Amino acid sequence: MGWCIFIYNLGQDADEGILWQMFGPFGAVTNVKVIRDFNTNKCKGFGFVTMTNYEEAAMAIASLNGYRLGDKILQVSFKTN
Amino acid sequence: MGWCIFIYNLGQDADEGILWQMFGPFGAVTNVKVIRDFNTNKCKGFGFVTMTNYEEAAMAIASLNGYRLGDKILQVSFKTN
RNA sequence: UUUUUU
Whole-number Cα distances in Å, A16 to A11, A19, A31, A69: 12, 5, 9, 14
Nucleotide nearest to A46 (CA to C1'): C1
- How far is Cα A38 from Cα B46, in angstroms, rounded to an integer? 14
- DSSP letter assigned to residue A48: E
Whole-number Cα distances in Å, B39 to A1, A41, B36, B62: 12, 28, 9, 34
How many angstroms separate the CA of A15 from the C1' of C1?
18
Beta strands in chain A (DSSP E): 3-8, 29-36, 43-51, 68-69, 72-73, 75-78
Q: What's the resolution in A?
A: 2.0
* Residue at shortest CA–C1' distance from C1: A8
Q: Which residues touch strand C (CB under 7 A)?
A: A 4, 6, 8, 31, 33, 35, 38-39, 44-46, 48, 50, 75, 77, 79-81; B 4, 6, 8, 33, 35, 44-46, 48, 75, 77, 79-81
Chain C nucleotides reached by a protein CB under 7 Å: 1-6
* Approach to solving: X-ray
Backbone dihedral region for residue A19 (phi beyond 0: left; psi -120 to 50: alpha; all else: beta)? alpha
> Dihedral angle at the C-alpha atoms of A46, A49, A55, A60, nearest 10 degrees?
-50
- Distance between first and last Cα of chain B: 15
Instruction: Give the three-class secondary structure for B18.
Output: helix
- How far is Cα B47 from Cα A66, in angstroms, rounded to an integer? 37
How many angstroms separate the CA of A20 from the C1' of C5?
26
For residue A5, count CB atoms less than 10 angstroms from its CB and return exposed for 0-12, middle for 13-18, buried for 19 or more. buried
Domain ranges for chain A, please list them: 1-81
* Residue at shortest CA–C1' distance from C6: B35
